[PDB]
Structures are given as structure tokens and as C-alpha cells.
Amino acid sequence: GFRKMAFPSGKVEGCMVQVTCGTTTLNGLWLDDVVYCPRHVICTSEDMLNPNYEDLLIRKSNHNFLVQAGNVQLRVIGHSMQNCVLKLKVDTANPKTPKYKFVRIQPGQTFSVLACYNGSPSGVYQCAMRPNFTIKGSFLNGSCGSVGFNIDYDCVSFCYMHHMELPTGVYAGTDLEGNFYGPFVDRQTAQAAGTDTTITVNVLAWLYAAVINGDRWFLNRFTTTLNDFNLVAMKYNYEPLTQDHVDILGPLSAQTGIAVLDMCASLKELLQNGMNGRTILGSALLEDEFTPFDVVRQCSGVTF
Amino acid sequence: GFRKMAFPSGKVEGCMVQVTCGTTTLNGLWLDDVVYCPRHVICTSEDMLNPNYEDLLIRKSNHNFLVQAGNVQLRVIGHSMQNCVLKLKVDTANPKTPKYKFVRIQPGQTFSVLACYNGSPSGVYQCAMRPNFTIKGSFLNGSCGSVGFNIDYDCVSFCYMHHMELPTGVYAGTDLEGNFYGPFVDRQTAQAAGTDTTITVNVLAWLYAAVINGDRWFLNRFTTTLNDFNLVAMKYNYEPLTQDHVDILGPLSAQTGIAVLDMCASLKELLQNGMNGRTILGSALLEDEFTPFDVVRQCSGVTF
Numbered sequence: 001g002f003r004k005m006a007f008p009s010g011k012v013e014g015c016m017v018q019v020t021c022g023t024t025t026l027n028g029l030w031l032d033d034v035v036y037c038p039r040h041v042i043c044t045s046e047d048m049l050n051p052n053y054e055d056l057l058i059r060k061s062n063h064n065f066l067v068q069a070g071n072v073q074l075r076v077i078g079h080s081m082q083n084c085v086l087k088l089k090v091d092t093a094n095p096k097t098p099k100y101k102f103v104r105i106q107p108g109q110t111f112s113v114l115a116c117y118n119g120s121p122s123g124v125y126q127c128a129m130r131p132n133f134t135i136k137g138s139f140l141n142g143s144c145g146s147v148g149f150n151i152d153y154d155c156v157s158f159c160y161m162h163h164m165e166l167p168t169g170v171y172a173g174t175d176l177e178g179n180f181y182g183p184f185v186d187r188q189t190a191q192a193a194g195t196d197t198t199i200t201v202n203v204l205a206w207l208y209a210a211v212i213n214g215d216r217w218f219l220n221r222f223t224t225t226l227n228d229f230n231l232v233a234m235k236y237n238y239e240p241l242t243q244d245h246v247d248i249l250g251p252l253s254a255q256t257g258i259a260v261l262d263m264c265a266s267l268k269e270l271l272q273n274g275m276n277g278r279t280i281l282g283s284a285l286l287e288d289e290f291t292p293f294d295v296v297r298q299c300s301g302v303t304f
Numbered sequence: 305g306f307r308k309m310a311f312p313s314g315k316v317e318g319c320m321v322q323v324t325c326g327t328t329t330l331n332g333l334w335l336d337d338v339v340y341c342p343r344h345v346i347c348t349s350e351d352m353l354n355p356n357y358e359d360l361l362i363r364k365s366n367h368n369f370l371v372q373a374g375n376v377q378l379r380v381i382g383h384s385m386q387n388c389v390l391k392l393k394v395d396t397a398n399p400k401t402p403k404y405k406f407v408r409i410q411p412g413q414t415f416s417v418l419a420c421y422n423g424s425p426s427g428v429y430q431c432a433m434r435p436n437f438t439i440k441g442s443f444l445n446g447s448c449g450s451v452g453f454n455i456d457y458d459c460v461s462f463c464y465m466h467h468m469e470l471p472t473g474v475y476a477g478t479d480l481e482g483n484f485y486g487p488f489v490d491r492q493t494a495q496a497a498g499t500d501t502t503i504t505v506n507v508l509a510w511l512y513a514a515v516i517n518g519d520r521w522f523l524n525r526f527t528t529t530l531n532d533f534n535l536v537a538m539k540y541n542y543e544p545l546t547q548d549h550v551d552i553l554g555p556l557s558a559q560t561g562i563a564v565l566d567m568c569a570s571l572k573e574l575l576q577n578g579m580n581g582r583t584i585l586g587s588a589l590l591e592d593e594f595t596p597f598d599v600v601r602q603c604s605g606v607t608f
């Protein structure tokens with residue numbers, strides 16, 4: 001058995017609140033005595049085409065932000081804009097605040113999203129920050145301010161806050177300092193995400209997951225070199241593989257006794273030949289949203 | 305965006321405990337003053353080939369069950385066996401007990417699993433009770449007593465407790481009354497799960513999810529009849545479709561303006577022609593682990 005698993009969401013559930021400004025409602029994250037939320041909460045539908053956020057925020061006072069935790073109204077005593085997020089100082093520290101960090105995650109790393117509407121949890125799933133700084137998710141109107149996170153032991157590392165959907169049907173957002181991942185801006189205009197490259201190291205990790213779990217039909221008799229493999233990767237829009245990537249796979253390699261470059265040769269033939277109707281760990285395509293760490297975590301039953 | 309989403313797990317996280325009997329540790333579920341767990345906690349490795357549970361349990365007393373909630377030892381004041389589960393009465397009611405129900409779920413319905421090790425949450429994912437009463441998951445040694453559930457508003461409906469892995473790499477377990485789903489027994493012997501039939505109504509639901517989300521390439525110019533479609537379903541190991549199934553799809557049908565039998569004709573041609581390298585909602589195969597309700601829930605942003 002190998003599945004895309006999210007972290008347990010309980011620690012984050014207790015941080016979610018509703019933030020309303022005028023007619024716009026979205027989600028906020030309540031840690032200590034601060035509530036973080038997307039700055040476009042201050043916009044009307046008109047404003048969103050071309051908002052001057054500095055001018056818009058100036059017509060706002062503390063009492064114009066309604067912050068609701070369950071059915072309880074929090075008192076806003078302070079507000080400021082940091083990049084693309086609002087920080088609303090409230091008079092009560094969240095008693096459920098977990099140990100936490102803000103972290104700007106690297107492309108190809110994974111996290112869990114707790115999708116929320118009106119300050120209330122809807123569901124949880126695992127995502128990756130793709131090379132082109134988008135994420136594949138499920139967000140609707142009202143989902144903004146939903147957060148992405150990792151849990152190491154007791155510490156929640158928040159890495160993502162949701163802001164927008166792109167014409168591709170993928171999504172974009174910020175770290176918890178309000179800085180977008182990628183080239184995106186919080187305005188309702190047409191915005192290009194670049195080519196969606198595949199996270200090579202993660203595809204390899206997942207092929208190691210398959211072998212560990214008994215799926216081995218794709219193992220072939222060849223090896224390759226980094227330079228030869230990467231020529232193939234470039235054609236298929238794969239990220240180039242580096243010795244750092246090889247090193248990172250070293251644990252899975254040793255465990256399976258399959259050299260990383262042998263697995264590269266297997267991947268190469270999968271890319272060049274397709275899967276011939278066959279599946280790997282129940283998938284008909286090559287999955288790139290498991291990191292090496294994810295694979296070791298899952299295969300060793302790490303708990304938080 | 306359309307994703308396999310689990311329920312938020314916080315309410316269930318607070319119910320998980322560790323149960324140890326001799327050398328065997330697994331997970332238990334602590335509701336009110338009762339802890340539920342798999343009865344094979346009483347077995348040694350030898351016993352598991354052919355255990356006489358009634359005789360084994362007789363050599364056990366309350367003090368032989370160690371129950372740990374975090375780092376706190378619960379006091380066992382009572383024990384009994386109900387079907388394939390143990391109920392250990394403890395002297396303290398769980399203060400975190402949510403509103404809850406025990407429900408025996410039907411084949412083709414979905415639920416979330418909170419995978420646990422040593423009483424501690426590892427991860428959460430969405431499953432279906434398959435027609436052959438197995439589930440596709442990720443469980444390792446130590447995972448037994450992990451539970452599956454649904455949440456309706458504030459009420460947690462527990463439907464599954466994990467007990468075993470089958471030679472197929474799928475899994476089997478019980479409802480919370482200790483009755484297995486399917487023909488399985490809690491003994492370490494070779495056990496057949498039958499043919500893994502596909503949940504037709506759910507494949508159809510997911511094709512409606514695709515159309516709602518803009519993926520419409522597979523819509524063709526044909527319709528069919530129930531009897532004609534079901535002849536095709538039988539060849540592909542699909543469950544027969546019934547008017548109850550048609551009725552259940554009626555909301556998605558009306559929303560999309562695609563008659564259920566028109567969608568059946570599209571599915572038929574997908575089954576007979578394959579997908580020609582194309583994907584639907586990012587999948588290269590037909591997914592059957594979303595119910596109609598799941599699709600409406602997700603497409604309408606239902607919260608708990």
C-alpha cells in the first residue's frame with residue numbers, strides 16, 4: 001500500500017477564523033494575538049481588476065474588519081499590510097496556538113492544505129509546490145486564506161496561503177510573509193504560469209516506493225549517465241537531475257539495491273515507451289508529488 | 305480543480321490511544337469511558353496462525369491491558385469481546401469525545417482514514433469500501449485500530465477499524481461492532497478477496513465532476529439504454545447500473561444538462577477505446593472512489 005497522505009489537520013483547524021470586510025468574507029489564520037489573511041479582503045468586485053491596495057487600505061479602520069472564531073467576535077486593535085497579506089492584531093491570543101514556524105518552501109517540496117470556507121474546515125489533501133510555482137488543488141470562491149503546512153513532530157511549519165485561481169485551473173498564493181510563490185500578482189488579470197516541468201527526483205522517489213512495495217515490472221537491464229539521462233529529461237519537460245538529487249535518493253537506493261542511474265534508465269524507457277496500459281502503484285502515469293522524504297516517512301510510519 | 309479530499313481529522317485525533325497487551329502494541333479508539341480495539345492485540349506471533357480467541361482472552365485480566373493517552377495511563381476496570389473487537393472500560397470518560405455514531409457503511413461509499421502508529425496520528429486519506437469489501441490504503445505493522453469515518457456537521461460517523469493486509473496489497477477490517485466487512489477472518493491465513501468490481505455510479509459521478517470543471521473531450525454523440533450499457537459493464541467488471549443509481553445522479557445530470565444515459569454512452573466508448581493517452585481531471589484511468597455526494601459536496605464547498 002502506498003497513498004497520497006495529508007498530515008493530521010487538528011492543530012491547524014484550531015487556528016482558522018473568518019474575516020469579513022464589507023461584503024467580502026474569507027479565511028484567516030489566528031496565531032498568538034495576530035490574524036493573517038489575504039489583503040484582497042478589502043476589495044470590492046470592481047476594485048479587483050486593478051486595485052490600489054495602499055489607497056484602499058487607507059479608507060479602512062480596525063472596526064471595519066470583522067473577525068469571527070466560531071461564533072465569538074474578536075476585537076481588532078491594529079492592522080497592517082505586509083506584502084500581500086493583512087495582519088490584524090486582536091486583543092486575545094489564540095489559546096489553541098500550536099508550536100509553529102513560517103517557512104518559504106522550495107519548488108518540488110510537498111505540503112498539506114486544509115481547505116476552508118467561512119472560517120470552517122472543509123477537507124485536507126497533499127500538494128506540491130510545482131517548479132512553476134503553482135499548485136494543483138480544489139479551491140472555490142471563499143477559500144482564500146486557506147493554508148498549506150508541514151508538521152515536524154509538534155511544530156507546524158506554515159508555507160502557503162491561498163489567493164487565486166489561474167486560467168489553467170491551477171492555483172497561486174503566498175508564503176505567510178505575503179510574498180507570492182512565482183511571478184503572480186493579486187489582481188484579476190490574465191496571468192501566465194510557465195511550462196509545467198515535472199519534478200524528476202520525486203518521480204524517481206515514487207519508482208523506489210513501487211519497488212519497495214513489490215511493483216517491479218518496469219525495471220530494465222540498462223543503466224545510463226546523468227548527462228545522457230538529462231538529454232531525455234529535457235525533451236519530456238523534466239527537471240535536470242543533479243548529484244544533489246542522486247545523494248538525496250541514496251537512502252532509497254541502498255534500501256532497494258537499485259543504483260540511482262539504473263532507475264534513471266528505467267524512467268527513460270518509461271518516458272520513451274509509455275506504460276503499455278500497465279500501472280505503477282495503481283497509477284497510469286508517472287507521479288511527481290512525493291518527495292524522497294515523503295516516501296521514507298510513509299514507508300517507515302513516521303508519526304507527529 | 306477537483307481532488308481526493310479527506311475530512312478534517314481533529315475530532316478523531318483526540319480519540320486515539322495506544323493499547324498494549326504483552327508485546328503487541330496497537331491503536332485504540334477512546335469514546336466516553338470505553339476503548340475499542342482489535343481483539344488480536346491479545347495474540348502472540350504464534351497464536352496468530354490459528355488463534356482461539358475465547359481461550360486466549362480468558363488468560364487475560366483488566367491489568368494486562370495497558371492503555372495510554374499521550375503519556376497518561378488509563379485505568380482499565382472492565383473488558384469484553386464483541387465480534388472481532390475488544391471493549392475496555394476505563395475509569396475516565398474521554399473529555400474530547402465528539403458527537404458520534406457507529407455505522408456499517410455500504411459498498412461503494414467513501415470515508416476518511418486516520419492512519420495511526422502507537423496511538424499517534426501519522427496521516428489522513430480518503431478511501432472507498434470496495435464492492436469486494438476491501439480498501440486501498442497504506443497500512444504497516446502497528447496500524448491496527450486506525451479508524452475510518454465520515455463527518456456530517458459536528459457528528460463523527462465511525463465506519464471502519466483496521467485489522468489486516470491481504471496478499472493483493474489491499475486491506476480488510478471491521479465496523480465498530482467488530483463485524484468484518486466481507487468474508488475475512490482475523491487469522492494469519494491466505495484469504496481470497498473476490499473480483500474487484502468497479503463502482504459504476506461513482507465513475508459516472510466523476511465524469512460529471514469533469515464536465516462541471518471544464519474537461520469535456522470524452523462527451524460523444526451517442527446515448528444508450530440501461531440494459532445495453534450493463535452488457536458492456538459486465539465485460540469490464542463494472543457493477544450493473546440501476547434506476548436507483550440513475551436517480552442518485554439526477555442532481556449532477558440536471559446541473560450539467562447531460563442525461564445519465566448519454567454519459568453512460570460516453571463511458572461505454574471510454575471502456576471500449578481507452579483514453580488514447582489523454583487524461584480526465586488529471587487521471588489516466590477512470591476513478592471510482594468519488595460518490596455522487598462527494599462530487600456535490602466538493603463542488604459546493606460543504607464545511608463541518
Ligand SMILES: *[C@H](O)[C@H](C[C@@H]1CCNC1=O)NC(=O)[C@H](CC(C)C)NC(=O)OCc1ccccc1
Nearest residue numbers: 040048139140141142143144163164165186187
Ligand atoms: C479568494 O477566496 C478567491 C479564490 C478563487 C476564486 C475561485 N477559485 C479560487 O481559488 N480568490 C479570488 O477571487 C481572486 C481575487 C483576486 C483579487 C486575486 N481572483 C481570482 O482568483 O480570479 C479567478 C477566478 C476564477 C473563478 C471564479 C472566480 C475567480
Ligand SMILES: *[C@H](O)[C@H](C[C@@H]1CCNC1=O)NC(=O)[C@H](CC(C)C)NC(=O)OCc1ccccc1
Nearest residue numbers: 344352443444445446447448467468469490491
Ligand atoms: C495490525 O497492526 C496489523 C496490520 C497489518 C500488518 C502489515 N500491514 C497491515 O495492515 N495486522 C496484522 O498483523 C494481522 C494480524 C492477524 C491476526 C489478523 N495479520 C496480517 O495482516 O497479516 C498480513 C501481513 C502482511 C505483512 C506484514 C505482516 C502481516
